[PDB]
Write a protein that binds this ligand. Sequence first.
Ligand SMILES: NC(=O)c1cccc(Oc2ccc3c(c2)c(=O)ncn3Cc2c(F)cc(F)cc2F)c1C(F)(F)F
Ligand SMILES: [Mg+2]
Length: 560
Amino acid sequence: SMSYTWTGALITPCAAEESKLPINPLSNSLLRHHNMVYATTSRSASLRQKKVTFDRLQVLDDHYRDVLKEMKAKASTVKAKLLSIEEACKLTPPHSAKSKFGYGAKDVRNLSSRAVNHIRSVWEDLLEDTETPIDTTIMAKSEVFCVQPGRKPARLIVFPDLGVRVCEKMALYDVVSTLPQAVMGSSYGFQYSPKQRVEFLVNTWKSKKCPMGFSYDTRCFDSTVTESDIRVEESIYQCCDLAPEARQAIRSLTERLYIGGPLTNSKGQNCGYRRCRASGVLTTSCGNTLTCYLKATAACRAAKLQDCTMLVNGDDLVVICESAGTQEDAAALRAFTEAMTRYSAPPGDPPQPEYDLELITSCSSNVSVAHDASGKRVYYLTRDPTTPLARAAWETARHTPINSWLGNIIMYAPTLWARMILMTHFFSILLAQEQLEKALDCQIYGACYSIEPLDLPQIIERLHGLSAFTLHSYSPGEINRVASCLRKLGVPPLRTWRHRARSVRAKLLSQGGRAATCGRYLFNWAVRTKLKLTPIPAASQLDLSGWFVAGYSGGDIYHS
Ligand SMILES: NC(=O)c1cccc(Oc2ccc3c(c2)c(=O)ncn3Cc2c(F)cc(F)cc2F)c1C(F)(F)F
Ligand SMILES: [Mg+2]
């Protein structure tokens, strides 16, 4: 069927949309070519709609069914708990979109009588009505990027009302938080911190006689998800031990929301119908991961690829297997794509066989290689720094809800660019404004987390280890990329940052306390007479468990 059907009503913005990087003194410090940075707006919605709208072709086979059963079998071991209204309410981000029924996230988190009362009726309605399509809002997503030799048309997010969202959590939070791992095991990507992901990719790579890997980019995965895919996804959830009300809720949510439903713009106009995966629901991440995993695993058997290890993060897929030879691999890969195309997962860019782990891009990142104080090779996760930097500038010139830069510093603490540029730039600003103590919100695998800048040293050592503060001698490949990026964006070169870091480090050291700790560990690369960095006491006191359990992008989740 058609992924989408449009009435003609436009995807409207519910507020003024900013698309250009303002000429700000502070942003200008980080990057000079401000005209290269842009934010997508609803003005590009039609370009997207045309890209995501098409008929889906899907032919299933024996391999798909075999793998599906294997998956359900693991699923049968899961026992999911039905969250309470209070629990699910406590998971709602403070900035979440208000309900059109007289309340907002604030009232939800405060267990406001009005909110709760409405959440109850919505739930009661899910238990009674198994058919009525639940309404959803469609908005153009506002994201920041750098221009390219044109521009990316805004992505379209689709999400139901606040009430329904709390209800999703009640019935499915525990499930989407535990089922993926139980089913895919080591292959489930959101369970790993950046360090563990590299570990897994490196060990997996070395477990092959002669490794061959490739990333598989599905063309607009969300609109390639069929009603069949979503029901198959429910059949997997249905294998869990569920409370009676949770089973019905899931059965209803599937038919009324997850498989499709009416689309409404910000003005209340009927935009069209959706027959594919909505981006703004709680099951989006789990569902896509399961679907991507299922199709890929069946495609591997069908394609004759040997000993295929999957690492799946939602629609993002990486595959590592036993090479069978250059020509045999090219053939096998093409066969893999045909199987995937039949499973309704056509490729965007044709996949290419890789024989060098550092050449595979998954989750926009890749495994590189540097050295620690001792001088031994240390693997770590990195990526092209264009977008992170572009967004850093943006978030520097404008008050933005989520600070992707803070999230990038954490996820990419050991990289050349995050340490040399992100930490320097931001700490410098925070110190100049005396905000080193204000906690900031950021995201990790979709979930919102409140973090204090001064705590970064602990978090980094904990997530990455001490080597993140001593890495050096990066690969020529990683260096070239950072170099080109800076050249392209008009970002000051190494020397400029070192001088700035040397200044910040000193200023932080003079403040003592946690700030001094920031200056000693974060900026140890700036000095000649380096300090002897030892494990930070409070690092062992840290509990970053809930940080890397599952993916929640689009799920509207907040881990307090
Ligand atoms: N084009 C440039 O501006 C430019 C010019 C010369 C070199 C260069 O790469 C660099 C810069 C510093 C480097 C290395 C490579 C390295 O391999 N090994 C060590 N240091 C010191 C260093 C470090 F260990 C970590 C850190 F967090 C900042 C640092 F300073 C660059 C760049 F953009 F970083 F890629
Ligand atoms: Mg974990």
